[PDB]
Ligand binder design. Structure first.
Ligand SMILES: [Cl-]
Length: 182
């Protein structure tokens, strides 16, 4: 049979696929869409493909202008397979430590480079990890705190309310609340 991993990440099925766009920002968070080979392991209602991602964005009357992918554990999809042409960036966010400073800067640079080129539209920066929750929430909130001067608890609350789930990792939360501006 074909070569290619296709295991469903632990807890992936448990999360709402796509959050609401965060008002006051151009962020939106989602869990990783899965390419076709994964679907052998899913019920139809559990599937969440790249097509489903774009459909759900459209349902909100929004449009992605950049995808930032934080994942590393498997090949989940190839950007060139996305059914809409959208700028893409991989930023590997590995393991469970607070994302390192290089990762934080690469995130900020990607966001800022997108914004500076899109001042006549409201296209979004879509950010995903596996669950679209922990690494995603951390980086979004770190951006808001550092770049926009948002109080950490206000960033976390906005992220949580829009995502549909609360940021879980306590070390991430603690760094947001008490760690340094990068
Ligand atoms: Cl991952």
């Amino acid at each position: 049979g074909p070569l290619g991993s296709n295991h469903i990440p632990e807890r992936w099925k448990d999360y709402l696929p796509v959050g609401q766009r965060m008002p006051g920002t151009r962020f939106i968070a989602f869990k990783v869409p899965l390419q076709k080979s994964f679907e052998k392991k899913l019920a139809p209602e559990e599937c969440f493909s790249p097509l489903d991602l774009f459909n759900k964005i459209r349902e909100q009357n929004e449009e992605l202008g950049l995808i930032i992918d934080l994942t590393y554990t498997q090949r989940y999809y190839k950007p060139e397979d996305l059914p809409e042409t959208v700028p893409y960036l991989k930023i590997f966010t590995v393991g469970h430590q607070v994302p390192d400073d290089e990762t934080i800067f690469k995130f900020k640079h990607a966001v800022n480079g997108f914004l500076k080129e899109n001042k006549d539209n409201d296209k979004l920066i879509g950010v995903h990890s596996t669950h679209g929750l922990n690494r995603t929430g951390y980086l979004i909130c770190r951006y808001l705190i550092d770049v926009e001067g948002v109080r950490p608890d206000d960033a976390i609350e906005l992220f949580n309310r829009c995502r549909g789930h609360c940021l879980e990792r306590q070390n991430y939360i603690e760094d947001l609340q008490n760690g340094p501006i990068r």
